[PDB]
């Protein structure tokens, strides 16, 4: 048994994310997405939201499901008691960012995998911050996003 | 016939952009600087002084205009109807960053070519940014900025 | 003698700059760390404070100095007198923002060097932000700094 967790904002999620939310509910018995509060990223969507958001973008995974949380990731991911971490890498990624992360929740989950995937080479380029600031200023967004979202995106400027 | 533009924040305009303005005249029959309001980066100049600064590092060159936006790039491109988009590269910052905004964008306008330049090496290394906070800290920054942008930035504090 | 300036926010030190510094007090006859103020990006410890946390943590190396400073670095280091800054460079930190830095720093202070270590590997992926945040959540950090620094954050979230 493989239970991964997929740690994010996900403000919003977007077709990047379900790309590899698809992949991996294929790959491991559990899926779970841990969407983070991230109080300091002001988020445009709330934790509810989001992980409503989330949630209607992966009903039909049935090995998938969507939390929020709010604490320390080493902390929940035990609690979640996940033997896997997931972590998308795509543009860079940021890819500093995303080894300063693994080898920091690794001394405070030494049991926990990091692991990676990639999205399709069709969604390599989808990025939350800039789908946001599309929407914001009414660009077309629907290939980018999953429908729900890029009408909880549309009303949310309007 | 070719007609370019050159989008950016330019808080302000660098000896970098105007190296690449200079070399961007030179091949097209007509440039447009598309200065974006760009309001999530809280810009040091207001989105008029600062098309006023890169009219006044420009006004020399007679295929080169300027003009300030604050609507979806994509959108703005169109009624300019210019058909190639023009960015520097240089460090690289974040060479993707780059590959991330083209690709979203030849999905939004899928007409519009995505171009580069590169600046001489001797301003390939001046940040908007840095130059803002050295002027800010009362450093000397001539080097780095046009005459006009100097004078500005030193009023800007004082 | 080289006297060798090491600027940062130090918010928190962590073990990550107590080994670069460790390195630096072996190779130079003096040693000065220089906390950067840095208001722009509101430091969880005042000025003072991590001014403090570097001196207990570096009190034990003779050739080594803690300032703080709140004005232009390369106006700064003529105030103290040092011909080396010295720069951390572990894993596409901030790729050239480190160069970037150091070639405008070369235009504002041509006589003083710019110099670069790399931390023990067991240190290239300690992050300030991510101790910061980690010891927010009540997370163990003590494997990522001293433990006065370590006693500092505790006591700073409750
Ligand atoms: C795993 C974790 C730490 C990563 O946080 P994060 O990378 O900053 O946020 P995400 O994981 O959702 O992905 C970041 C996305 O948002 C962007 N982003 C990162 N920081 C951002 C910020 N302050 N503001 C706006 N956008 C940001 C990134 O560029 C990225 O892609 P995008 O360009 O498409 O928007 C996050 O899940 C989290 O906060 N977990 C719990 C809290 C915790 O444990 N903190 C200590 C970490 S060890
Ligand atoms: C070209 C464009 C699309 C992208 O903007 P941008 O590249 O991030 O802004 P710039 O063009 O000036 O280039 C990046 C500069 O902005 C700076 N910058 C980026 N984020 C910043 C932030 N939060 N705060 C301050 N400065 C910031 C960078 O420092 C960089 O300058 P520097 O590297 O010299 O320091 C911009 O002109 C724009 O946003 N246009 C219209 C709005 C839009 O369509 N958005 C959807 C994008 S597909
Ligand atoms: C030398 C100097 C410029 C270094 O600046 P800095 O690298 O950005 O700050 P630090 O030295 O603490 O090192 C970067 C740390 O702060 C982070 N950081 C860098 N820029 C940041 C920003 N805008 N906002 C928040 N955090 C930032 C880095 O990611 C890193 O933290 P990390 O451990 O989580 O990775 C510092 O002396 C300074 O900021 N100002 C001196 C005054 C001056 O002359 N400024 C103009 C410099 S040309």
Same mark, same amino acid.
């Given at each position: 048994?493989?239970?991964?967790? &997929?740690?994010?904002?996900?403000?919003?999620?977007?077709? %990047? *994310? %379900?790309?590899?939310?698809?992949?991996?509910?294929?790959?491991?018995?559990?899926?779970?997405?841990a969407?983070?509060?991230?109080?300091?990223?002001?988020?445009?969507?709330?934790?509810?939201?989001?992980?409503?958001?989330?949630?209607?973008?992966?009903? *039909?995974?049935?090995?998938?499901?969507?939390?929020?949380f709010?604490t320390l990731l080493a902390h929940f991911v035990?609690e979640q008691?996940?033997?896997?971490?997931?972590? %998308?890498?795509?543009?860079?990624?940021?890819?500093? &960012?995303?080894?300063?992360?693994?080898?920091?929740?690794?001394?405070?989950?030494?049991?926990?995998?990091?692991?990676?995937?990639?999205?399709?080479?069709? &969604?390599?380029?989808?990025?939350?911050?800039?789908?946001?600031?599309?929407?914001?200023?009414?660009?077309?967004?629907?290939?980018?996003?999953?429908?729900?979202?890029?009408?909880?995106?549309?009303?949310?400027?309007?």
């Open positions: 048994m493989n239970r991964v967790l &997929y740690p994010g904002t996900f403000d919003p999620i977007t077709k %990047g *994310h %379900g790309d590899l939310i698809e992949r991996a509910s294929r790959l491991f018995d559990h899926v779970i997405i969407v983070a509060a991230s109080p300091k990223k002001n988020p445009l969507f709330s934790l509810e939201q989001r992980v409503a958001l989330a949630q209607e973008v992966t009903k *039909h995974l049935p090995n998938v499901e969507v939390v929020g709010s035990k008691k996940a033997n896997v971490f997931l972590r %998308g890498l795509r543009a860079v990624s940021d890819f500093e &960012y995303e080894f300063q992360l693994a080898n920091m929740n690794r001394q405070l989950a030494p049991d926990v995998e990091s692991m990676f995937l990639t999205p399709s080479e069709k &969604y390599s380029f989808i990025s939350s911050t800039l789908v946001r600031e599309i929407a914001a200023l009414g660009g077309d967004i629907s290939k980018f996003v999953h429908p729900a979202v890029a009408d909880a995106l549309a009303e949310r400027f309007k």
